[PDB]
Amino acid sequence: IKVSRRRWAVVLVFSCYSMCNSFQWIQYGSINNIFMHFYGVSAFAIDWLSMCYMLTYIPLLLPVAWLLEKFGLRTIALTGSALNCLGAWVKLGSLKPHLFPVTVVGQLICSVAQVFILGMPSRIASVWFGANEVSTACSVAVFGNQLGIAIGFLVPPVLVPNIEDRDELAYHISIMFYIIGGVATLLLILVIIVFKEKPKYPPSRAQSLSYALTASYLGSIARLFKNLNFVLLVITYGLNAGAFYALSTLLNRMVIWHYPGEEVNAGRIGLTIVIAGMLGAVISGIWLDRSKTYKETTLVVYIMTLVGMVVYTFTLNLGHLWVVFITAGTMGFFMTGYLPLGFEFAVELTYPESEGISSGLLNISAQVFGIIFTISQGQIIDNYGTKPGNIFLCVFLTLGAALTAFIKADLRRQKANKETLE
C-alpha cells in the first residue's frame, strides 16, 4: 500500500472551487442594500438569491448521492465545477437594471452545483488518503467551504460601492462577476487535469477492503425516524443551523438599518462571524474527541448560542460598532462550533446506520428551517423592525434548548466500541 502526492492537490483544488461556490451564495446578501437599488426589487427578492441555495439542496440531495455512487468521483467533480463555472458566466449577462430574472437563473445553476460540491467533503478523503489522514482531509474540504463565506462577506462591499447611478454601479458589479467567473473557469480547467478517477494504489487497508466489498435509502430513513432521540436531535440541529443561514442572509439588512452607510464594515462583521466560528469548530471538535461527553457539551454549547443571540439582539442598536463585532463573533463562535457536535452526536445515536444518511437528514433539516426562518424574519424585519426579527430567532433557539435537554444520551456506538474490545 502506497499513497500518492496528488492527494493534497486534489483537496486543494476542491476546496478552491468550493470556496468560489460559497462566495456566490452570499455575494448578493453581503451587499443586499446595493442590489435592491440596482434591480429595483425589494429585499425579499434579493434574499431569494441566497435562499435558492437552500431550496435546491432539499430534493437534489438524494439523487446526487445516487449519482456519486454510480458515476464515480471525477464525473461528479466535473459536473459540480462546470455548473459553478457556468452559473458564474450566466450572471454576467444580467448586468442591467431590468435583467433580474437572468440573475436568478444564473444563481440557480450555482445552487445546483452546491449539492454536487457539499456531497463529497468526506468521499475525497476516503479514496485519496490513508486511514490516519481521513479525519484531517475531511476538515480541509469543509475548511474551504466555510472560508468562502468569509470571503463572500468582505470582498463585495469593497468592489461594489453604494452609488446611486445605475450605469456607474454596473461597472463595479461587473468587476466582481468577472473575477468570480474567471476564478471558477480557472478552477474548472484545474479540475479537468488533476482530479483522476482513483489513485494508482489504495491509500489504506480499509480502502482495499472497501473496493473488494463493493439497504435502500428509504429503508434506512424509516428506521432512523423510529429513533425518537435522533428525531429530536434532527429538529434541534435544524433550529441552530437554520438560524445561521437566516442571520447571515439578513445580516446586511440589520446592520445597515441601524448604521447608515458602513457597508464595508457590515462585510467585516460577516467575516468575523464566520472566522470566529471556524475557530469554534476546531475547539469543539478537539474538546469532544478528548472528553467523549457528547450529551453535556452539546447542551452547554447550544445554550451559549442562545446567550449569543440575546446579547447580540439588544447590543446591535446601542450605537457602538465595535461591540457588534464582539457580540457577533461570540455568537458565531458557538453556532458553527455546534455543527461538529451535532454530526458526532447523530452518528453516536444512529449506530450502525451509515453516516451519510444520518448527516443527510441533519443537512435537510438545516435547509428546511433556514428557509422558514429567513422568510419569517424578513417579514418581521420589514413590518416590525429588526429587534423583533432577532427576538424571533431567540425564542426559537430557546425552544431548541429545551428539546436538547430531553435528549437521552443513548451513546450506543460507544457501547458497541467497548463490546468489540471485550
Residue numbers in the entry: 78 to 291, 295 to 502
What are the paper's exact sentences on this?
Human feline leukaemia virus subgroup C receptor-related proteins 1 and 2 (FLVCR1 and FLVCR2) are members of the major facilitator superfamily. Here, we show that FLVCR1 and FLVCR2 facilitate the transport of choline and ethanolamine across the plasma membrane, using a concentration-driven substrate translocation process. Our findings indicate that both FLVCR1 and FLVCR2 operate as uniporters, facilitating downhill ligand transport independent of sodium or pH gradients.
We determined structures of FLVCR1 and FLVCR2 in as-isolated (without exogenous addition of ligands), inward-facing conformations at 2.9 Å resolution. The inward-facing conformations of FLVCR1 and FLVCR2 exhibit a close resemblance to each other, with a root mean square deviation (Cα r.m.s.d.) of 0.993 Å. Both structures feature a wedge-shaped solvent-accessible cavity that is mainly created by the separation of TM4 and TM5 of the N domain from TM10 and TM11 of the C domain. This is mainly achieved by the juxtaposition of TM1b (N domain) and TM7b (C domain). Furthermore, we identified a stable interdomain salt bridge between D124FLVCR2 (TM2) and R333FLVCR2 (TM7b), reinforcing the external occlusion. Our cell-based mutagenesis studies show that alanine substitutions at N110FLVCR2, E343FLVCR2, D124FLVCR2 and R333FLVCR2 individually result in a significant decrease of choline uptake and an almost complete perturbation of ethanolamine transport, highlighting a critical role of interdomain interactions on the extracellular surface for FLVCR2 functionality.
